[PDB]
Design an enzyme around this catalytic site. Structure first.
Site, PDB file in Angstrom:
ATOM      1  N   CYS A 111     -14.692  43.688  36.511  1.00  0.00           N
ATOM      2  CA  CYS A 111     -13.637  42.904  35.892  1.00  0.00           C
ATOM      3  C   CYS A 111     -13.811  41.772  35.251  1.00  0.00           C
ATOM      4  O   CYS A 111     -14.164  40.725  35.965  1.00  0.00           O
ATOM      5  CB  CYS A 111     -12.366  42.768  36.985  1.00  0.00           C
ATOM      6  SG  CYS A 111     -10.970  42.114  36.380  1.00  0.00           S
ATOM      7  N   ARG A 114     -11.105  37.909  35.941  1.00  0.00           N
ATOM      8  CA  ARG A 114     -11.095  37.529  37.297  1.00  0.00           C
ATOM      9  C   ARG A 114     -10.847  35.859  37.674  1.00  0.00           C
ATOM     10  O   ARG A 114     -10.859  35.642  38.738  1.00  0.00           O
ATOM     11  CB  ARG A 114     -12.401  37.661  38.100  1.00  0.00           C
ATOM     12  CG  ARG A 114     -12.427  39.155  38.613  1.00  0.00           C
ATOM     13  CD  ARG A 114     -13.631  39.543  39.222  1.00  0.00           C
ATOM     14  NE  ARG A 114     -14.788  39.645  38.358  1.00  0.00           N
ATOM     15  CZ  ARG A 114     -16.165  39.409  38.694  1.00  0.00           C
ATOM     16  NH1 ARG A 114     -16.192  39.567  39.928  1.00  0.00           N
ATOM     17  NH2 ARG A 114     -16.855  39.352  37.901  1.00  0.00           N
ATOM     18  N   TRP A 283      -2.625  42.245  32.396  1.00  0.00           N
ATOM     19  CA  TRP A 283      -2.276  42.251  31.059  1.00  0.00           C
ATOM     20  C   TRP A 283      -3.791  42.654  30.219  1.00  0.00           C
ATOM     21  O   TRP A 283      -4.786  42.483  30.752  1.00  0.00           O
ATOM     22  CB  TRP A 283      -1.741  40.881  30.443  1.00  0.00           C
ATOM     23  CG  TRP A 283      -2.699  39.720  30.830  1.00  0.00           C
ATOM     24  CD1 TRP A 283      -3.762  39.287  29.989  1.00  0.00           C
ATOM     25  CD2 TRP A 283      -2.501  38.750  31.751  1.00  0.00           C
ATOM     26  NE1 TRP A 283      -4.303  38.017  30.438  1.00  0.00           N
ATOM     27  CE2 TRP A 283      -3.311  37.672  31.443  1.00  0.00           C
ATOM     28  CE3 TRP A 283      -1.580  38.606  32.746  1.00  0.00           C
ATOM     29  CZ2 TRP A 283      -3.620  36.780  32.224  1.00  0.00           C
ATOM     30  CZ3 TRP A 283      -1.535  37.300  33.375  1.00  0.00           C
ATOM     31  CH2 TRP A 283      -2.420  36.381  33.092  1.00  0.00           C
ATOM     32  N   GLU A 288      -9.230  47.074  24.579  1.00  0.00           N
ATOM     33  CA  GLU A 288      -9.162  48.202  25.232  1.00  0.00           C
ATOM     34  C   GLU A 288      -8.052  49.167  24.527  1.00  0.00           C
ATOM     35  O   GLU A 288      -8.556  50.416  24.559  1.00  0.00           O
ATOM     36  CB  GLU A 288      -8.315  47.887  26.603  1.00  0.00           C
ATOM     37  CG  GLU A 288      -9.369  47.093  27.630  1.00  0.00           C
ATOM     38  CD  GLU A 288      -8.549  46.760  28.873  1.00  0.00           C
ATOM     39  OE1 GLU A 288      -8.339  47.520  29.556  1.00  0.00           O
ATOM     40  OE2 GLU A 288      -7.964  45.699  29.011  1.00  0.00           O
TER      41      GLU A 288
HETATM   42  C1  HEM Z   1      -4.844  39.570  34.695  1.00  0.00           C
HETATM   43  C2  HEM Z   1      -5.161  40.220  33.374  1.00  0.00           C
HETATM   44  C3  HEM Z   1      -6.592  41.108  33.543  1.00  0.00           C
HETATM   45  C4  HEM Z   1      -7.379  41.433  32.647  1.00  0.00           C
HETATM   46  C5  HEM Z   1      -7.462  40.478  31.441  1.00  0.00           C
HETATM   47  C6  HEM Z   1      -8.395  42.302  33.304  1.00  0.00           C
HETATM   48  C7  HEM Z   1      -9.354  42.915  32.430  1.00  0.00           C
HETATM   49  C8  HEM Z   1     -10.038  43.891  32.651  1.00  0.00           C
HETATM   50  C9  HEM Z   1     -10.626  44.820  31.716  1.00  0.00           C
HETATM   51  C10 HEM Z   1     -10.796  44.688  30.131  1.00  0.00           C
HETATM   52  C11 HEM Z   1     -11.258  45.874  32.540  1.00  0.00           C
HETATM   53  C12 HEM Z   1     -12.198  46.889  31.813  1.00  0.00           C
HETATM   54  C13 HEM Z   1     -11.060  48.092  31.762  1.00  0.00           C
HETATM   55  C14 HEM Z   1     -11.802  49.305  31.332  1.00  0.00           C
HETATM   56  O1  HEM Z   1     -12.628  49.530  30.496  1.00  0.00           O
HETATM   57  O2  HEM Z   1     -11.195  50.438  31.589  1.00  0.00           O
HETATM   58  C15 HEM Z   1     -10.893  45.554  33.738  1.00  0.00           C
HETATM   59  C16 HEM Z   1     -11.514  46.218  34.985  1.00  0.00           C
HETATM   60  C17 HEM Z   1     -11.000  46.033  36.204  1.00  0.00           C
HETATM   61  N1  HEM Z   1     -10.207  45.280  36.581  1.00  0.00           N
HETATM   62 FE1  HEM Z   1      -9.472  43.712  35.558  1.00  0.00          FE
HETATM   63  N2  HEM Z   1      -8.080  42.669  34.374  1.00  0.00           N
HETATM   64  C18 HEM Z   1      -7.044  41.907  34.927  1.00  0.00           C
HETATM   65  C19 HEM Z   1      -6.126  42.053  36.026  1.00  0.00           C
HETATM   66  C20 HEM Z   1      -7.031  42.771  37.115  1.00  0.00           C
HETATM   67  C21 HEM Z   1      -6.330  42.721  38.457  1.00  0.00           C
HETATM   68  C22 HEM Z   1      -4.830  42.070  38.976  1.00  0.00           C
HETATM   69  C23 HEM Z   1      -7.017  43.353  39.320  1.00  0.00           C
HETATM   70  C24 HEM Z   1      -7.007  43.779  40.815  1.00  0.00           C
HETATM   71  C25 HEM Z   1      -6.152  43.383  41.550  1.00  0.00           C
HETATM   72  C26 HEM Z   1      -8.203  44.027  38.541  1.00  0.00           C
HETATM   73  C27 HEM Z   1      -9.414  44.662  38.852  1.00  0.00           C
HETATM   74  C28 HEM Z   1     -10.156  45.198  37.993  1.00  0.00           C
HETATM   75  C29 HEM Z   1     -10.942  46.440  38.619  1.00  0.00           C
HETATM   76  C30 HEM Z   1     -11.065  46.823  39.847  1.00  0.00           C
HETATM   77  C31 HEM Z   1     -11.436  47.170  37.299  1.00  0.00           C
HETATM   78  C32 HEM Z   1     -12.311  48.060  37.263  1.00  0.00           C
HETATM   79  C33 HEM Z   1     -11.771  49.310  36.960  1.00  0.00           C
HETATM   80  C34 HEM Z   1     -12.548  50.849  36.915  1.00  0.00           C
HETATM   81  O3  HEM Z   1     -13.705  50.603  37.613  1.00  0.00           O
HETATM   82  O4  HEM Z   1     -12.178  51.850  36.291  1.00  0.00           O
HETATM   83  N3  HEM Z   1      -8.241  43.366  37.207  1.00  0.00           N
HETATM   84  N4  HEM Z   1     -10.302  44.235  33.726  1.00  0.00           N
HETATM   85  C1  LIG Z   2      -5.653  45.522  36.119  1.00  0.00           C
HETATM   86  C2  LIG Z   2      -6.054  45.932  34.636  1.00  0.00           C
HETATM   87  C3  LIG Z   2      -6.050  45.193  33.600  1.00  0.00           C
HETATM   88  C4  LIG Z   2      -6.489  45.217  32.212  1.00  0.00           C
HETATM   89  N1  LIG Z   2      -6.560  44.538  31.420  1.00  0.00           N
HETATM   90  N2  LIG Z   2      -6.940  46.788  32.035  1.00  0.00           N
HETATM   91  C5  LIG Z   2      -7.007  47.477  33.070  1.00  0.00           C
HETATM   92  C6  LIG Z   2      -7.429  48.740  32.927  1.00  0.00           C
HETATM   93  C7  LIG Z   2      -6.047  49.298  32.283  1.00  0.00           C
HETATM   94  C8  LIG Z   2      -6.324  51.174  31.978  1.00  0.00           C
HETATM   95  C9  LIG Z   2      -5.445  51.827  31.458  1.00  0.00           C
HETATM   96  C10 LIG Z   2      -5.607  53.086  31.097  1.00  0.00           C
HETATM   97  F1  LIG Z   2      -4.596  53.785  30.414  1.00  0.00           F
HETATM   98  C11 LIG Z   2      -7.017  53.721  31.265  1.00  0.00           C
HETATM   99  C12 LIG Z   2      -7.949  52.911  31.922  1.00  0.00           C
HETATM  100  C13 LIG Z   2      -9.041  53.443  32.472  1.00  0.00           C
HETATM  101  C14 LIG Z   2      -9.450  54.884  31.925  1.00  0.00           C
HETATM  102  C15 LIG Z   2     -10.539  55.487  32.896  1.00  0.00           C
HETATM  103  N3  LIG Z   2     -11.826  54.977  32.578  1.00  0.00           N
HETATM  104  C16 LIG Z   2     -12.629  54.906  33.717  1.00  0.00           C
HETATM  105  C17 LIG Z   2     -12.642  55.726  31.618  1.00  0.00           C
HETATM  106  C18 LIG Z   2      -7.728  51.566  32.247  1.00  0.00           C
HETATM  107  C19 LIG Z   2      -6.489  47.180  34.447  1.00  0.00           C
END
Ligand code: HEM
Ligand SMILES: Cc1cc(N)nc(CCc2cc(F)cc(CCCN(C)C)c2)c1
Ligand code: HEM
Ligand SMILES: Cc1cc(N)nc(CCc2cc(F)cc(CCCN(C)C)c2)c1
Ligand SMILES: C[C@H](O)[C@H](O)[C@H]1CNc2nc(N)[nH]c(=O)c2N1
Ligand SMILES: C[C@H](O)[C@H](O)[C@H]1CNc2nc(N)[nH]c(=O)c2N1
Ligand SMILES: [Zn+2]
Lengths: 413, 408
Positions: A111, A114, A283, A288
């Site tokens: 992420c 963070r 957000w 994305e």
């Molecule tokens: C506050 C604004 C946030 C932004 C801008 C952000 C940004 C991102 C982005 C760009 C990704 C990659 C998404 C993808 O390629 O699928 C990601 C993944 C992730 N984020 Fe964040 N995030 C935010 C909030 C959060 C919150 C609130 C949590 C948990 C409480 C979180 C936990 C994670 C986790 C666990 C992943 C990995 C998802 C996966 O493995 O499929 N994020 N985040």
């Molecule tokens: C918490 C949070 C913030 C942020 N900016 N973006 C995310 C991911 C949102 C999301 C939205 C969504 F529609 C699909 C996915 C992941 C699709 C499956 N992957 C493993 C290929 C992710 C989550």
């Protein structure tokens, strides 16, 4: 394992020192002879398995609040211990629960956002018992998080697993997603990614509009029961039509997206407790939607159609007609979102913010796990500061984990 | 175990059996992953290393356990015994270098691995001989624009004391000059080396694109300066197809990419001097060389001439500037019949190559971090392709910079 580890930034020569990797709890997939850093994805806990896990978490919590070894700390330990001993599990105080969810976000190596980890609204929904109750809690999450475009990160946490046969699950991978319908001719309408899930919904009773941006219903499972459909009130689903600041024709593509990114298929682990339904939201980073949702070949795949309207040479690949259409789509996504005052962060800002965050973490926490493969934006990578940043990746607990898809494991009543 | 890799776009799955054959460590442990860290002999050490190599040579030519095989092992044994090293047959030299290219986890060009022209230069003894050998490499490998892959191999290490080293990290790179006013002329990535040449008696033209001289070390001796003859150094004026103002920027790059600072390792032998060369992927120059903040750094300038809004990052001006810069780079090389591959084509070929490798060799080590182009990542097919990284031998490895270990 060696005490200090070094990471270099090759753009600034800055060298940070990682002591926190020592607290690593689980496996990465890698071994000495092979690395899985690019691999996407590399019945309950017994008493003796849970005791040390729980203590670890408690000790950690009491070291955060600067009360380690205190009377309240030892007393908490004995209580937790008595509780595992007699009931085979335990329950987290509201404080412990909130610390734990913020810390699983903070530990989420994949992420890039963070820096905001400490500002997270935690909704305790452990008192829930039904799918309607779930539908209600989730609806409130959406409305709180959305905040009329001024998004705020939140998690809603449902009751922890007990015996495995009584799980709470959100069946939607994300709270808000667009439907996907397979045609008989093989073509797809909507978001091709969601075809399987859309079919499930239809079988379970959903009447599909059969359109490009049809918001899927929630499919909610409580206490091990069969899931149930509820539609989300459309007034709760903020949406942005996609236009371009230079190209007047861009709105003619009829493109919109949802403003709330909200993951609902991951499992939150805290002190050895498994929170199989724990939707969270934040957000969007512009890329994305601009790059992945819109341009991936198996997603909306609009690159060719935007290229056409741009009047580009599309025979030669070396004209870079693809990369040119890509930049312009992402320019429109950030433009549309800012003009509707919906919170969104461009990939330059986010990556810069994250380098700052990482540095503070190394400073104060002695480290910051990171998955370079996921952290680096899917467009213009080398021109962001994270590309050049060396990152150690390891798994700290509490954490967010993946878990099997519920329709693969559910026993139908 | 067998292992599986999945492409998330096509859903194709491949099965890796090849990883079983590696021995060198990667750096990771079950708890820490270093997939983004850039840089993570004796008679008794030497024999089994030699043995495995010969074994897989004679296995690759379908004569395993042959009489030819058995005497080779005998020949090699007696030789390490009585000399504390051993020499490679010419057939083995050629195989070792092609296969070290083939195992280069960080190379996207490896579909070409077997069409490698190999220049044996193990009879070299002076810096002058090296220079003559290198010129011939440059001239052959350049071939008037139609680039061809080649490697030149100088004598192996013996005792550390008498190492052959090319001190240039790459045969052709532009100089870097520190200015009184703090800024930097030429190439900022080379500034140290440029001053080691000047300190050795190089007369710098103090320019933005001055080809740096060769600094060759032979048999542990002091290095010696040598200018490459200009007619051997092919360069490209960078110009834009639609932006007629682009030529005025004054950009050129050299046509021949040639890494000279690494270390080829075959059967436990260490070739500390083994310059190899192929042709450029457009992004190498268009993105990294020109647009890194620690390189030529032109995005500001280009976006100015392009007249973009440069006040907020969210107008993605850098991302526009970048695409136009890479268009020019491809268009210039193509217009000059100088070989170059764009990142869409180079990636396709790689995925095709992976398929080939899995099909006939049971795997293909790849470093996703390095394989993914530094621009437009996910719109290339390798972003979505899972890759397993592991260290197969023979390999190209890294070594300490020469000026950190040499005594004069
Ligand atoms: C506050 C604004 C946030 C932004 C801008 C952000 C940004 C991102 C982005 C760009 C990704 C990659 C998404 C993808 O390629 O699928 C990601 C993944 C992730 N984020 Fe964040 N995030 C935010 C909030 C959060 C919150 C609130 C949590 C948990 C409480 C979180 C936990 C994670 C986790 C666990 C992943 C990995 C998802 C996966 O493995 O499929 N994020 N985040
Ligand atoms: C918490 C949070 C913030 C942020 N900016 N973006 C995310 C991911 C949102 C999301 C939205 C969504 F529609 C699909 C996915 C992941 C699709 C499956 N992957 C493993 C290929 C992710 C989550
Ligand atoms: C023939 C066309 C070739 C192409 C298109 C190509 C392409 C590339 C590219 C783009 C990189 C990334 C380098 C960087 O960004 O710094 C790379 C790395 C590499 N290539 Fe190739 N290459 C080619 C030929 C060769 C040859 C002939 C060899 C050796 C025999 C080779 C071995 C390597 C190695 C060892 C690396 C890793 C560099 C490092 O670790 O610093 N390649 N290649
Ligand atoms: C053989 C080969 C083919 C090809 N297409 N490209 C290369 C690399 C060329 C190159 C040429 C060069 F001058 C510098 C570099 C990278 C220097 C180290 N980085 C990590 C800061 C690379 C080598
Ligand atoms: C195979 C590879 O791991 C996969 O395509 C990854 C690469 N990096 C990624 N990075 C992010 N942020 N999101 C992703 O889905 C992916 N996909
Ligand atoms: C820290 C990280 O290893 C570093 O930025 C890497 C990432 N990927 C790369 N990929 C290529 N082709 N060349 C590079 O120099 C790098 N640099
Ligand atoms: Zn690893």
């Amino acid at each position: 394992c060696p005490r200090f580890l070094k990471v270099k930034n090759w753009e600034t020569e800055v060298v940070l020192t990682d002591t926190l990797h020592l607290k690593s709890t689980l496996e990465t997939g890698c071994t000495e002879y092979i690395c899985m850093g690019s691999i996407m994805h590399p019945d309950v806990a017994t008493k003796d398995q849970l005791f040390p896990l729980a203590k670890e978490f408690i000790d950690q919590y009491y070291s955060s609040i600067k009360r380690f070894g205190s009377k309240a700390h030892m007393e908490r330990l004995e209580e937790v211990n008595k509780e595992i001993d007699t009931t085979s599990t335990y329950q987290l105080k509201d404080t412990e629960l909130i610390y734990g969810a913020k810390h699983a976000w903070r530990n989420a190596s994949r992420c890039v956002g963070r820096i905001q980890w400490s500002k997270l609204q935690v909704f305790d929904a452990r008192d829930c018992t039904t799918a309607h109750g779930m539908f209600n809690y989730i609806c409130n999450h959406v409305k709180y998080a959305t905040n009329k475009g001024n998004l705020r990160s939140a998690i809603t946490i449902f009751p922890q697993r007990t015996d495995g046969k009584h799980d709470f699950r959100v069946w939607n991978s994300q709270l808000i997603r667009y439907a996907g319908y397979k045609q008989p001719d093989g073509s797809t309408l909507g978001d091709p990614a969601n075809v399987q899930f859309t079919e499930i919904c239809i079988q379970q009773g959903w009447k599909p509009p059969r359109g490009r941006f049809d918001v899927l219903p929630l499919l909610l499972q409580a206490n091990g029961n069969d899931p149930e459909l509820f539609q989300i009130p459309p007034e709760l689903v903020l949406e942005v039509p996609i236009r371009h600041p230079k190209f007047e024709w861009f709105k003619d593509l009829g493109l919109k997206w949802y403003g709330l990114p909200a993951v609902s298929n991951m499992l939150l682990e805290i002190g050895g407790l498994e929170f199989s339904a724990c939707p969270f939201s934040g957000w969007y980073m512009g890329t994305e939607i601009g790059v992945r949702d819109y341009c991936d070949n198996s997603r909306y795949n609009i690159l060719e159609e935007v290229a056409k309207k741009m009047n580009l040479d599309m025979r030669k690949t070396s004209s870079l007609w693809k990369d040119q259409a890509l930049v312009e789509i992402n320019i429109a996504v950030l433009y549309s979102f800012q003009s509707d005052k919906v919170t969104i962060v461009d990939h330059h800002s986010a990556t810069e913010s994250f380098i700052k965050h990482m540095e503070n973490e190394y400073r104060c926490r002695g480290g910051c796990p990171a998955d370079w493969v996921w952290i680096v934006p899917p467009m213009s990578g080398s021109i962001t500061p994270v590309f050049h940043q060396e990152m150690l990746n390891y798994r700290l607990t509490p954490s967010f984990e993946y878990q099997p898809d519920p329709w693969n494991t559910h026993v139908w009543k």
